[PDB]
Write a protein that binds this ligand. Structure first.
Ligand code: UDP
Ligand code: UDP
Lengths: 287, 290
């Protein structure tokens, strides 16, 4: 028979998941009600794709989208200049948050982007996407603009998740936070959140950032605050060593949130969380 | 940190085991060896695996058993024709109702065998080699202090569950054990002393549970590994691998005291070990304490 996890999943899908997120750009603009929207593309040596991603979002600039920023992580290729020519604002880690020395990894970039943006809603889109669709941003912000109580929207793709998602993230969530197994692509890089939420949570480093944000949001607000939207079809993207490193950090970040100690020992082959940005810039009682 | 891993690889890992069958037979020193093949609906491959081991029966190997887990194909008759004794779960341990999964089968075989050394070999192997059992027992017979030998396969120039799930989780929770190349492998040998005294995890958790319990109780130097030869990674459906991963997680969490919800994947998940076989077969166990 059904479990409590099953029952919650079914109703969460009914209320908080959209297979056909067909809101129009015009209706979303009309719903902003004074809120502004920032779009952030984290980038490190993505010269072949960053411009193409920017180009798909640029038509929204000045209407639905208020700012379009490429947060560069120290690229040595032509990422920055291609993002400039394509119509984005390029901001380095150092300019985004001058008072803190950078550390490596994606989570650092997304955290710093909170200091460099002003939008009430922040949308993250990976800069390595080959086939970005222009409706990604509208779909991601729909539930934030139209659905009471939602603070985090995860974009998922139908396929014509991957290995880390299905072997590592979802099974560990089943063990530790089973309600969150309803989220189809918990590691996805296309997602949006409110400034209120994102400024208030720590940011995990590196490959842990997505899972960390998902679990921190759940632990504070539960499923009601999390939604997901189908962004369309896309094929699964990596070398096993990259995936194993990803997994190891997903494990470390989940463990840090779920009361499991971690040796700190990285993968044998043959760094810390950043505090909430509201400690530097700018309820759901259990009683 | 890698100092410990380096010394263990130098002393407890063999990429090219030299041992001959005759040398191993001469080292038995009165110990006996049982070989157990768990099998559920493996009619296509079980006979071929048995045939590679049968020439050792009466010499290096004292018992050769297929522990059938409820097959409805021709697994049993084909294993018998190849020279194995076929034992059902019920015959192995008649007064205890069977539960599903591989760990149950390996645990029950302890009550149906007499060896001082028990060797487990999967019955679904497509390309078995007759030197598997010799290589697995070498460190038990010729080294001192080894109680568990893990057979690994060199890969042409482990799988996704091994590299994305088992090894990273061991790095987090039992960091020395990342030195074991293929912790989830189904070809391994253990002493009766060890195997009779530890709980057995259910289903797909049995291998990692035995590895972790051996490590904790007897130490790193009680574990060895041997290269069984080059074997290509087996391609399994992602849903099967995900179910395996979920049970590996459950078993490791049990061994660490992490609350696991028991919730499976939208898949079977048990958190309940079988107790040490010496609790149910105390007189058998005492007879084999030697
Ligand atoms: O330190 C990093 C790593 C990645 N990325 C970006 O984050 C996205 C995801 O990259 P990936 O997960 O492949 O990171 P990597 O595998 O290169 O560490 C892409 O848009 C990268 O350019 C980034 O800005 N900084
Ligand atoms: O409940 C079970 C599950 C598996 N096995 C055996 O254990 C090995 C690994 O099991 P798996 O299910 O991965 O192999 P498959 O059944 O897919 O061939 C094989 O020799 C199986 O026949 C068994 O005896 N009982």
């Amino acid at each position: 028979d059904l479990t409590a996890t099953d029952l919650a999943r079914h109703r969460w899908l009914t209320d908080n998941s959209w297979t056909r997120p067909t809101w129009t750009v015009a209706e979303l603009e009309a719903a902003k009600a004074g809120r502004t929207i920032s779009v952030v593309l984290p980038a490190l040596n993505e010269e072949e794709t960053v411009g193409g991603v920017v180009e798909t979002i640029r038509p929204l600039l000045g209407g639905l989208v208020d700012e379009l920023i490429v947060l560069d992580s120290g690229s040595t290729d032509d990422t920055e200049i291609r993002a400039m020519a394509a119509g984005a604002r390029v901001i380095s880690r150092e300019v985004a948050l001058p008072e803190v020395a950078p550390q490596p990894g994606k989570g650092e970039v997304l955290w710093r982007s909170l200091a460099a943006t002003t939008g009430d809603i922040i949308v993250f889109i990976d800069s390595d996407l080959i086939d970005p669709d222009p409706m990604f941003v509208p779909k991601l912000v729909g539930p934030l603009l139209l659905s009471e109580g939602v603070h985090l929207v995860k974009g998922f793709y139908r396929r014509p998740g991957g290995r880390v998602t299905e072997l590592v993230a979802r099974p560990l969530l089943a063990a530790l936070r089973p309600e969150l197994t309803c989220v189809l692509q918990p590691l996805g890089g296309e997602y949006a959140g409110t400034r209120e939420l994102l400024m208030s949570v720590p940011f995990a480093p590196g490959y842990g950032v997505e899972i960390g944000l998902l679990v921190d949001t759940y632990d504070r607000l539960g499923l009601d605050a999390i939604a997901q939207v189908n962004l369309g079809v896309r094929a699964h993207r990596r070398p096993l060593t990259d995936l194993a490193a990803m997994s190891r950090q997903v494990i470390a970040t989940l463990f840090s949130r779920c009361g499991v100690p971690d040796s700190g020992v990285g993968l044998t082959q043959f760094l810390v969380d950043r505090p909430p940005m509201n400690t530097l810039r700018g309820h759901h009682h259990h009683h």
